[PDB]
Amino acid sequence: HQTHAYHMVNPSPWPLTGALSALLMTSGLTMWFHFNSMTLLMIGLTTNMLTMYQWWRDVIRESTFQGHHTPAVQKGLRYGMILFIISEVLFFTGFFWAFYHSSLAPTPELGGCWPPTGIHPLNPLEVPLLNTSVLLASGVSITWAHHSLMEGDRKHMLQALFITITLGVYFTLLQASEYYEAPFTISDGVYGSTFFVATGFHGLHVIIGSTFLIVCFFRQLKFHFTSNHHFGFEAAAWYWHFVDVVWLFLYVSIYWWGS
Amino acid sequence: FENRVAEKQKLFQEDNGLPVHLKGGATDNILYRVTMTLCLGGTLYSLYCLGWASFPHK
Amino acid sequence: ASAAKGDHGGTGARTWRFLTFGLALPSVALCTLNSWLHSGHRERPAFIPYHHLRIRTKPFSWGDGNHTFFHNPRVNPLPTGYEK
Amino acid sequence: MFINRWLFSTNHKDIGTLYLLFGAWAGMVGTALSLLIRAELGQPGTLLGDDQIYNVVVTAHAFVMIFFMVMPIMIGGFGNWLVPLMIGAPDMAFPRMNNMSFWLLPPSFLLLLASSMVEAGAGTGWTVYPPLAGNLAHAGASVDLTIFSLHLAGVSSILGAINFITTIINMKPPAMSQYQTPLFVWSVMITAVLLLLSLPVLAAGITMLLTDRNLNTTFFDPAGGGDPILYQHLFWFFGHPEVYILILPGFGMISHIVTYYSGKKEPFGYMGMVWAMMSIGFLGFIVWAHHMFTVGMDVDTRAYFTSATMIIAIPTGVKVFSWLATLHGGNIKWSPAMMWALGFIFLFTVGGLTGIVLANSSLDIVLHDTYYVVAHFHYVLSMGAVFAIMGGFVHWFPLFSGYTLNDTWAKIHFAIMFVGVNMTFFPQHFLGLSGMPRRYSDYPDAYTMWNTISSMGSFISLTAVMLMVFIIWEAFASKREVLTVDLTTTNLEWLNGCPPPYHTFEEPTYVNLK
Amino acid sequence: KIKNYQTAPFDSRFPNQNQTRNCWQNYLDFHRCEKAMTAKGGDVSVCEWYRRVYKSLCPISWVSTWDDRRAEGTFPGKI
Amino acid sequence: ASGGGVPTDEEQATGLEREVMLAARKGQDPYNILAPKATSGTKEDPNLVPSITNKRIVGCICEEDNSTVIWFWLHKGEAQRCPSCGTHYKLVPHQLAH
Amino acid sequence: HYEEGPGKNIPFSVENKWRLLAMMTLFFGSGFAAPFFIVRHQLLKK
Amino acid sequence: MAYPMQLGFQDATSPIMEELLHFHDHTLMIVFLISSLVLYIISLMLTTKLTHTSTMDAQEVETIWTILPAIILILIALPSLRILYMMDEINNPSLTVKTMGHQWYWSYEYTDYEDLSFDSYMIPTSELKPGELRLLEVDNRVVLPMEMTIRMLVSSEDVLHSWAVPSLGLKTDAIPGRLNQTTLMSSRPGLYYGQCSEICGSNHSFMPIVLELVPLKYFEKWSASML
Amino acid sequence: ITAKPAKTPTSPKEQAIGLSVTFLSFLLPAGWVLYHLDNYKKS
Ligand SMILES: CCCCCCCCCCCCCCCCCC(=O)OCC(COC(=O)CCCCCCCCCCCCCCCCC)OC(=O)CCCCCCCCCCCCCCCCC
Ligand code: HEA
Numbered sequence A: 001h002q003t004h005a006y007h008m009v010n011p012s013p014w015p016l017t018g019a020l021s022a023l024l025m026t027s028g029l030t031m032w033f034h035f036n037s038m039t040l041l042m043i044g045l046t047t048n049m050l051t052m053y054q055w056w057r058d059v060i061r062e063s064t065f066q067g068h069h070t071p072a073v074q075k076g077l078r079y080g081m082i083l084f085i086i087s088e089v090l091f092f093t094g095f096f097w098a099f100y101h102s103s104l105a106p107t108p109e110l111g112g113c114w115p116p117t118g119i120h121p122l123n124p125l126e127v128p129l130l131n132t133s134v135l136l137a138s139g140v141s142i143t144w145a146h147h148s149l150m151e152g153d154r155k156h157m158l159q160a161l162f163i164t165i166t167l168g169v170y171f172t173l174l175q176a177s178e179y180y181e182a183p184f185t186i187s188d189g190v191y192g193s194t195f196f197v198a199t200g201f202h203g204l205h206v207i208i209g210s211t212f213l214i215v216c217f218f219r220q221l222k223f224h225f226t227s228n229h230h231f232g233f234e235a236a237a238w239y240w241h242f243v244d245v246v247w248l249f250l251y252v253s254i255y256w257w258g259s
Numbered sequence B: 001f002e003n004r005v006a007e008k009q010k011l012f013q014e015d016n017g018l019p020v021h022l023k024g025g026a027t028d029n030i031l032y033r034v035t036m037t038l039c040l041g042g043t044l045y046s047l048y049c050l051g052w053a054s055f056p057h058k
Numbered sequence C: 001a002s003a004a005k006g007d008h009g010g011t012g013a014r015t016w017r018f019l020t021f022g023l024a025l026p027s028v029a030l031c032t033l034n035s036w037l038h039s040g041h042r043e044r045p046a047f048i049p050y051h052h053l054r055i056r057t058k059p060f061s062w063g064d065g066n067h068t069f070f071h072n073p074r075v076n077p078l079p080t081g082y083e084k
Numbered sequence D: 001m002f003i004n005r006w007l008f009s010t011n012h013k014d015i016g017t018l019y020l021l022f023g024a025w026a027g028m029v030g031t032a033l034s035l036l037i038r039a040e041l042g043q044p045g046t047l048l049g050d051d052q053i054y055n056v057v058v059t060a061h062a063f064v065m066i067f068f069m070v071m072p073i074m075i076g077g078f079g080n081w082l083v084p085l086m087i088g089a090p091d092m093a094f095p096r097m098n099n100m101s102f103w104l105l106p107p108s109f110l111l112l113l114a115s116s117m118v119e120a121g122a123g124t125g126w127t128v129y130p131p132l133a134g135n136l137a138h139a140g141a142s143v144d145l146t147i148f149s150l151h152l153a154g155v156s157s158i159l160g161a162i163n164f165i166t167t168i169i170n171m172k173p174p175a176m177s178q179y180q181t182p183l184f185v186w187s188v189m190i191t192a193v194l195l196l197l198s199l200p201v202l203a204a205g206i207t208m209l210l211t212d213r214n215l216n217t218t219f220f221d222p223a224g225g226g227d228p229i230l231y232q233h234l235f236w237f238f239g240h241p242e243v244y245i246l247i248l249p250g251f252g253m254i255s256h257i258v259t260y261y262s263g264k265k266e267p268f269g270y271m272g273m274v275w276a277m278m279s280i281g282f283l284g285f286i287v288w289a290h291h292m293f294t295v296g297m298d299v300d301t302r303a304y305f306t307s308a309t310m311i312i313a314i315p316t317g318v319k320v321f322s323w324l325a326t327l328h329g330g331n332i333k334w335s336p337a338m339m340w341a342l343g344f345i346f347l348f349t350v351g352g353l354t355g356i357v358l359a360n361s362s363l364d365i366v367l368h369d370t371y372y373v374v375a376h377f378h379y380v381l382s383m384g385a386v387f388a389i390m391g392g393f394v395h396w397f398p399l400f401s402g403y404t405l406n407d408t409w410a411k412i413h414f415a416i417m418f419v420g421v422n423m424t425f426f427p428q429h430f431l432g433l434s435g436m437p438r439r440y441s442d443y444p445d446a447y448t449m450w451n452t453i454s455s456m457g458s459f460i461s462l463t464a465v466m467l468m469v470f471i472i473w474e475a476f477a478s479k480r481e482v483l484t485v486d487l488t489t490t491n492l493e494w495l496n497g498c499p500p501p502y503h504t505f506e507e508p509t510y511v512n513l514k
Numbered sequence E: 001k002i003k004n005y006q007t008a009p010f011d012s013r014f015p016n017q018n019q020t021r022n023c024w025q026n027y028l029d030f031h032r033c034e035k036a037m038t039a040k041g042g043d044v045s046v047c048e049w050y051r052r053v054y055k056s057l058c059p060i061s062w063v064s065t066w067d068d069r070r071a072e073g074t075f076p077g078k079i
Numbered sequence F: 001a002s003g004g005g006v007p008t009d010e011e012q013a014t015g016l017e018r019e020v021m022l023a024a025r026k027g028q029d030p031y032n033i034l035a036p037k038a039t040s041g042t043k044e045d046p047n048l049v050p051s052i053t054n055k056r057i058v059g060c061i062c063e064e065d066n067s068t069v070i071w072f073w074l075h076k077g078e079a080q081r082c083p084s085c086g087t088h089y090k091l092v093p094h095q096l097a098h
Numbered sequence G: 001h002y003e004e005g006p007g008k009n010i011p012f013s014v015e016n017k018w019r020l021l022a023m024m025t026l027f028f029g030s031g032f033a034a035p036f037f038i039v040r041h042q043l044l045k046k
Numbered sequence H: 001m002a003y004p005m006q007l008g009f010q011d012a013t014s015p016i017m018e019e020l021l022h023f024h025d026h027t028l029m030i031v032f033l034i035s036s037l038v039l040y041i042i043s044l045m046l047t048t049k050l051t052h053t054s055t056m057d058a059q060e061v062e063t064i065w066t067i068l069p070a071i072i073l074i075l076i077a078l079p080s081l082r083i084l085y086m087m088d089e090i091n092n093p094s095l096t097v098k099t100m101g102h103q104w105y106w107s108y109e110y111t112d113y114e115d116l117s118f119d120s121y122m123i124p125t126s127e128l129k130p131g132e133l134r135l136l137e138v139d140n141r142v143v144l145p146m147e148m149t150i151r152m153l154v155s156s157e158d159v160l161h162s163w164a165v166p167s168l169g170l171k172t173d174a175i176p177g178r179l180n181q182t183t184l185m186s187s188r189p190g191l192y193y194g195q196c197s198e199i200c201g202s203n204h205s206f207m208p209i210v211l212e213l214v215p216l217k218y219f220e221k222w223s224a225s226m227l
Numbered sequence I: 001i002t003a004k005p006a007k008t009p010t011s012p013k014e015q016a017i018g019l020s021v022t023f024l025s026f027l028l029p030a031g032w033v034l035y036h037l038d039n040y041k042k043s
């Protein structure tokens, strides 16, 4: 029997199924890019979702249902989430470097100018500005949800969190429409490359963060959170503010300054 | 909805020796077998695909 | 363009709901208006087969290999120009 | 029970053991690749084929030694075994995520092996520069399998970094400050910070290469307005921190070994050692373009990268002198692990000094892309990182296994390896000064004598590697069980016996605050 | 004026190892000058200094690609 | 406006989290979250080291801000001295109802 | 529980030293041989 | 070129390369001294039965071994950067030559006056003439005028290469889409050899560079004859 | 460090066998590939 406060985790298959899912997704992408087949990739995506589902399910079982998240355990999870977000910031930093490298020194092939000849950027005062207001608003509403939770107010937590998720979904549909309507593509030189890969990874993180908020919404419906203990919500709110801040950098850099 | 966390706490704290990933009952076992079967089967398939791609095909 | 509201007795849920409905969502509604007043299709420019655009170094892994993933026939020309 | 224990582990020692076995197997692969390089160069003419098959071998040699041998052994192996025990913690912060960091590595290795079996392999150099690594000059799957191998290894180490930082910050005894934790623990924390910050940037760059190869982007393709040199910036922004990632845990183990076999209770200058590792970690992020002095950069940029690179000699020199001051007055035990550490101190210093030669961008014009660079980095890697690994392995093998090595054989092994590596790499300085390029499968005739000697050196090192396997076999074959270990009062990781029980520190240590 | 041209002189606008923009600028300047002269019925001979500098500096294949793109209507620089 | 419906920890914390929370209310630290405060360390006034078994490892920081910690097993019975600096420690074994 | 102690905290048996020699021989030998056979494979293609 | 059993740099052919030799001598002396000092101190720490194992104060001694290395670094950096900037100094070339890397050979363009360009390929070992050097000779040498300041511009029409001539202290990467500049000045006539210095595929080992430095009048007549 | 005498002592003859087997496990497969290189290239 232990007399420290930390969590000895039961032996688990999910590290291995996750590692194999990574093999299947990467060899799947290889098969898709080179051997005209999606089979391995669909298997890998499926086992990856199953792995995430059961792993985080088990974390909920360990904490809400079994009590293993003492304050010391929670403190470690706070550090882990902050470090994870730091690594994602550096990942985006590489795409911002690529954007500034190409746009500050536009080569002769581009016309020696930025934006390149033949590129007609979106108007940053139209849908991109609307998107900015949507994610900024969702930062306000998730803050309302957090205070409601701390104050023990179930109904207003749910309402504010629903609003936050709805705005996330609105951003995602607006961006999907903008992608379809854009007159330039990912194959339109370095302008299309930087634009779509940087906003596209951001878009994926908006989807990830919205999924996390939705997990939190159903956990709240099921009363898992207490007014003092709700780290999944805290982590999803941190991740959501990260996604909002990456957007503001994208808007200022690519949409506005880069227009 | 009603708060049924106490019931789930009883279930997952039951002294039955089961690891947490199976402690929900028989459905956990099924989802586990499906996951592991897809992973292990998929991994064999990927080795097959390596073998295939390792040689030219005219 | 600075700020200028002025609450802060002790931030709470009531204040953040006030901000949500009194400033954040009205901003979204106003930009939603602005956007639905500047919707409407711009005229597509002459096609010019610029060599730094419509890059194809390897076919795409979908379709006929020559259409981008969110290809829009109205505004996205192929390397040989707009589709009929 | 076997699958539960070894495939579903949540235990830091067993996962540490898994990493040590994985890295030992990788070390064999990387050794064989190194002998194929030196066979090709061991006499003038062509042995295998042209530069493609040659540089698939070179490329794989480097990725295997770096990502599947050094980093899994130092961080995954010694890190997982030693860090929780050295702070009295019951395991790592995220014991189940820890297991996924391990299990991502066999698939990463499989993808690299697949890259070399399909098409004509990725013959790019471990830097994977475009356009050679792009879809026209390296059409087909090999480079994409390489990129994906790096993705998985990158994810493994980023999650491991999160684990190690969290564990080291959060799970010490409540009375122990960060300035009361052993230097090897510091060295792992600092390496993990470097991994956390640098690998996402590599991931961004190689993902851009992937999309240039498959999605018709043009980040690195001048036809779309891209620039091959942007790839180099992104790669080396990772690549210089990476070599400090490769050496810092080594520095940590060296501090423990030198202290222990000097009969000292503590290293000389503990806070200076902490300062030096932190300074190295920080400076290691602001120097990357010393890998790019010949690409056409402005002169003031070259002046800056010359000057910033040389600064790192100051904290590194504090560490060397502090190791010498730890030996000073010691009751020196001439154990095999001590010999590895002493060989480290000297050969690492030589390789660091030739790195300072290369930091001078004016001279680097002539030395860049020559064997002088190869000589610099094999002095710090084959006679630095590897010597620290072998030192740590012989020192802590009785803790991990409960059995003793034969010290006379371990001293023979050190002696053979020491001759072999110096015979391999010392002549490479002359080849580099006199202008032999890197990544060549054959050389003008004048360069024959030193290439011949270098290749003979590589076979001596092969003999040492074979002998190492026999020595480990002999230890497990004879089963000499450990009884008593000296100096446990300042080496907590021994205090639970050899091997320690599966669960240690179920009851934490008692440390008061006063 | 400045004949006995030997090669392109040092140009403070392009003092660094990367000379791509020097070749490009003089190529543009020459063809800009030639368009202006030929239109208003002047003499392209005044464009000669740009012509000699770009021919000295620019890879043959760059000039040739750029010329091909001007004739095709796909040259992305402004002339 | 205002309503309830969110469980408190007092209502819903379970397992070890609840044990830690309830002991903290009583000012007790069965799970070693806090650093113990030293006594004078004499043979008369030894540091009292709780344990759920008959030995536990002690780490002794001899002088304030030493970076070197001295580690040793403390066994049930007569007080023992820290090898480096002599500070006394005595084990006080119990069952985890403490 | 799990077995503890020397020879028991490892995923391979050390109960018979000659079976162990064979296992270690396959293990390290397969790693060292793999690059030679990959080279052969690439040579036999073209 | 390099010669058998060579230990150091090829003999300097340009004043910049001579500068590098003296700076390397300066730096190598320091490297030898520091590495010797460390080896010697190691041996000294290890050769006595006398002991002193109590705690040792570090403050005073770490001044020494921070300040002395800082000083040494500055003694390296000062002549290092002097040469750096002198290599960058304006010099007014009297000729520009371009070289384009290719898989696997170099082409050369001398377009100051006429359209002169040609390819330059390794001589196959089976076709060397007696006395010629394996893997180093080319069919068409880069003829250049001796004792004059030459602007070399380097690029590539496919993958990366790098254009190097060690005895003139030259190495400039060949990057497609980019025109890198270096300056070349030979104090002597003769033949100066280099090799492609950026991995570029199957025949990276086999695309060398040969400069042929002759008096200006000979270069002019050769240039005329190469049209 | 101190240790018990070997529980299963490995005599010089046994060590010679282990070392010979170890060495041959590295040398024979590589030797076979390298011996036949010409047959691979000449193919
Ligand atoms: C340093 C690692 C350990 C050493 C390993 C090998 C040790 C043996 C050699 C080595 C014995 C130690 C003496 C080193 C230099 C010997 C060659 C030389 O004359 O070098 C000259 C220069 C430039 O040359 C020139 O422009 C002028 C040429 C002058 C020609 C006159 C004839 C000279 C004699 C011929 C040399 C024989 C070739 C040796 C062939 C050697 C093949 C292995 O080349 C270079 O820069 C080489 C750059 C090397 C940078 C690393 C320095 C580390 C030194 C450690 C010494 C501490 C004590 C060692 C004490 C050693 C015991 C630990
Ligand atoms: C363990 C790995 C490791 C380590 C620790 C280092 C450490 C250093 N290296 Fe690195 N290096 C590599 C692995 C490593 N290197 C690799 C793999 C490459 C090639 C990558 C590739 O192209 O594939 C490379 C390439 C490389 C280059 C590029 C050369 C080129 O490609 O043209 C340069 C240039 O500046 C460089 C410099 C340095 C310096 C200054 C240090 C310093 O950190 C060393 C400081 C140490 C000392 C100086 C010794 C101890 C000090 C004293 C005893 C004090 C007194 C000393 C003085 C006063 C000088 N290295």
Ligand code: HEA
Binding pocket: D020, D023, D024, D026, D027, D028, D030, D031, D034, D035, D037, D038, D058, D059, D061, D062, D063, D065, D066, D069, D070, D073, D124, D125, D126, D127, D374, D378, D381, D382, D385, D386, D389, D390, D393, D421, D424, D437, D438, D439, D440, D441, D454, D458, D461, D462, D465
């Ligand atoms: C850790 C990094 C590492 C290590 C250890 C080595 C080890 C060796 N390397 Fe290394 N090498 C590189 C990293 C390394 N190399 C890199 C990055 C490159 C550049 C690649 C490129 O240009 O793209 C390179 C390039 C390179 C070349 C230049 C190829 C070229 O330019 O054409 C050569 C040539 O001789 C060479 C030879 C050797 C040899 C003979 C060894 C021998 O010393 C190896 C001998 C064996 C060992 C050191 C044993 C290995 C370890 C174990 C078996 C582990 C034991 C496990 C436990 C105890 C748990 N290497």
Ligand SMILES: CCCCC/C=C\C/C=C\C/C=C/C/C=C/CCCC(=O)O[C@H](COC(=O)CCCCCCCCCCCCCCCCC)COP(=O)(O)OCCN
Binding pocket: A163, A166, A167, A170, C021, C022, C023, C025, C026, C029, C032, F001, F002
């Ligand atoms: C393509 C179309 C868009 C797609 C979808 C995009 C995103 C949608 C986002 C989610 C929206 C969800 C809405 C949920 C609304 C909740 C209404 C019910 C709750 C409620 O009405 O609560 C009241 C707030 O009301 C309230 O008017 C809430 C009113 C909200 C107002 C929003 C904005 C419209 C206002 C127009 C005014 C313009 C003012 C301009 C000047 C502004 C200067 C700053 C507070 O009352 P209470 O008495 O204290 O009660 C406490 C118990 N509830």
Ligand SMILES: CCCCC/C=C\C/C=C\C/C=C\C/C=C\CCCC(=O)O[C@H](COC(=O)CCCCCCCCCCCCCCCCC)COP(=O)(O)OCCN
Binding pocket: A029, A171, A172, A173, A175, A176, A179, A180, A181, A182, A183, A184, A185, A186, A187, A196, A197, A199, A200, A201, A203, A204, C068, C069, C070, C071, C072, C076, D151, D154, D155, D203, D207, D210, D211, D215
């Ligand atoms: C909110 C709107 C939707 C946002 C999210 C949309 C999907 C993004 C999915 C994943 C994003 C991840 C990688 C991004 C790669 C490029 C996608 C860029 C975003 C995008 O969707 O770009 C689209 C192109 O998609 C294409 O090529 C094909 C896209 C599908 C193939 C992806 C290939 C896999 C790449 C994997 C990268 C490796 C993973 C990273 C590993 C990191 C490890 C640490 C743009 O369409 P277009 O028709 O060119 O122009 C529009 C003209 N009307």
Ligand SMILES: CCCCC/C=C/C/C=C/CCCCCCCC(=O)O[C@H](COC(=O)CCCCCCCCCCCCCCC)COP(=O)(O)OCC[N+](C)(C)C
Binding pocket: D320, D321, D324, D325, D328, H037, H038, H041, H052, H055, H056, H057, H058, H061, H064, H065
């Ligand atoms: C390549 C790297 C080299 C670059 C150049 C570096 C050169 C370094 C040279 C430094 C020389 C410094 C020598 C210091 C030795 C003298 C101190 C000593 O060795 O003596 C100790 C002093 O310890 C005290 O307090 C004070 C603290 C402890 C002093 C001993 C530790 C200092 C040892 C430095 C060792 C350096 C080893 C070589 C590293 C290069 C003990 O002295 P006390 O009188 O207190 O006790 C004696 C008892 N009585 C009083 C009854 C006699």
Ligand SMILES: CCCCCC/C=C/CCCCCCCCCC(=O)O[C@H](COC(=O)CCCCCCCCCCCCCCC)COP(=O)(O)OC[C@@H](O)CO
Binding pocket: C001, C002, C003
């Ligand atoms: C942040 C969220 C709200 C954002 C709302 C927008 C706010 C502005 C921020 C960005 C400011 C720079 C934007 C530059 C855009 C281009 C316009 C420009 O740069 O204009 C110049 C002045 O700009 C200048 O930034 C002068 C400086 C601009 C000041 C704008 C007003 C706000 C200043 C106070 C802000 C509050 C304090 C914030 C806390 C520190 C000159 O005028 P032009 O019109 O060029 O005419 C020249 C004629 O020859 C053309 O025919």
Ligand SMILES: CCCCCC/C=C\CCCCCCCCCC(=O)O[C@H](COC(=O)CCCCCCCCCCCCCCC)COP(=O)(O)OC[C@@H](O)CO
Binding pocket: A052, A056, A057, A059, A060, A063, A064, A069, A077, A081, A204, A207, A208, A209, A211, A212, A215, A224, A225, A226, A229, A230, A231, A232, A233, A235, A239, F012, F013
């Ligand atoms: C289209 C793309 C598909 C593929 C991508 C991924 C898709 C979706 C992923 C969405 C992420 C959902 C994560 C759900 C986590 C639920 C588990 C959880 O939230 O667990 C909480 C702990 O937090 C914790 O582990 C924190 C766990 C944090 C994990 C998540 C961080 C996001 C990671 C996403 C992966 C990003 C990769 C991006 C690469 C470019 C449980 O503790 P509490 O909440 O305090 O409860 C206890 C109380 O009840 C006691 O009173």
Ligand SMILES: CCCCCC/C=C\CCCCCCCCCC(=O)O[C@H](COC(=O)CCCCCCCCCCCCCCC)COP(=O)(O)OC[C@@H](O)CO
Binding pocket: A007, A009, A018, A019, A021, A022, A025, A026, A048, A051, A052, A055, A058, A059, A062, A063, A068, A073, A077, A080, A081, A084, A087, A088, A091, D093, D094, D095, D096, D097, D098, D148, D151, D152, D155, D158, D162, D200, D203
């Ligand atoms: C080219 C295509 C390549 C694709 C490669 C994809 C590879 C990976 C497959 C990933 C499968 C993921 C499965 C879910 C993993 C959840 C991990 C998790 O949530 O880990 C948590 C710790 O990490 C923390 O919090 C904070 C960290 C949360 C991390 C969540 C997972 C991220 C996975 C992607 C990471 C890289 C992202 C990009 C960085 C640049 C919990 O730690 P455990 O030890 O479990 O439990 C501890 C117990 O006390 C909890 O009760």
Ligand SMILES: CCCCCCCCCCO[C@@H]1O[C@H](CO)[C@@H](O[C@H]2O[C@H](CO)[C@@H](O)[C@H](O)[C@H]2O)[C@H](O)[C@H]1O
Binding pocket: A035, A036, A037, A038, A039, A043, B037, B038, B040, B041, B042, B045
């Ligand atoms: C539980 C573990 C699961 C393991 C499952 C293993 C499944 C094996 C199914 C075999 O599928 C092969 O793969 C491709 C698709 O499935 C097909 O190729 C074809 O498939 C594509 C269909 O989208 C086309 O694009 C290409 O033309 C063509 O190569 C091919 O005929 C088919 O035999």
Ligand SMILES: CCCCCCCCCCO[C@@H]1O[C@H](CO)[C@@H](O[C@H]2O[C@H](CO)[C@@H](O)[C@H](O)[C@H]2O)[C@H](O)[C@H]1O
Binding pocket: D035, D036, D039, I027, I028, I029, I030, I031, I032, I034, I035
């Ligand atoms: C870089 C690492 C490599 C290090 C060098 C290896 C050192 C020697 C290993 C010996 O390897 C064996 O050598 C034999 C020759 O001596 C080969 O037999 C070959 O030659 C024999 C004699 O000609 C024939 O009997 C066999 O049938 C024929 O396979 C045999 O296959 C090979 O296993």
Ligand SMILES: C[C@H](CCC(=O)O)[C@H]1CC[C@H]2[C@@H]3[C@H](O)C[C@@H]4C[C@H](O)CC[C@]4(C)[C@H]3C[C@H](O)[C@]12C
Binding pocket: A154, A155, A158, A159, A162, B001, B002, F005
């Ligand atoms: C049924 C539930 C009451 C909470 C509880 O006591 O069970 C109520 C309270 C808050 C409600 C949610 C919030 O009002 C926000 C959303 C508002 C939409 O108009 C309906 C769905 C919406 C998602 C609501 C669904 C549902 O009726 C909720 C979840």
Ligand SMILES: C[C@H](CCC(=O)O)[C@H]1CC[C@H]2[C@@H]3[C@H](O)C[C@@H]4C[C@H](O)CC[C@]4(C)[C@H]3C[C@H](O)[C@]12C
Binding pocket: D271, D272, D275, D318, H059, H062, H063, H064, H066
């Ligand atoms: C102040 C700090 C920690 C002291 C402590 O609390 O124990 C110490 C530890 C290592 C010290 C540094 C190292 O000893 C290296 C340098 C030594 C020089 O003599 C002074 C600056 C110098 C950069 C030192 C400054 C300062 O005294 C440091 C940074």
Ligand code: CUA
Binding pocket: H101, H102, H104, H160, H161, H162, H196, H197, H198, H199, H200, H201, H203, H204, H205, H207
């Ligand atoms: Cu061209 Cu190497």
Ligand SMILES: [Cu+2]
Binding pocket: D239, D240, D243, D287, D288, D290, D291
């Ligand atoms: Cu570096």
Ligand SMILES: [Mg+2]
Binding pocket: D294, D368, D369, H162, H197, H198
């Ligand atoms: Mg290079």
Ligand code: NA
Binding pocket: A146, A150, A230, A234
């Ligand atoms: Na909270």
Ligand code: NA
Binding pocket: D040, D041, D042, D043, D044, D045, D046, D047, D441, D442, D443
């Ligand atoms: Na050869």
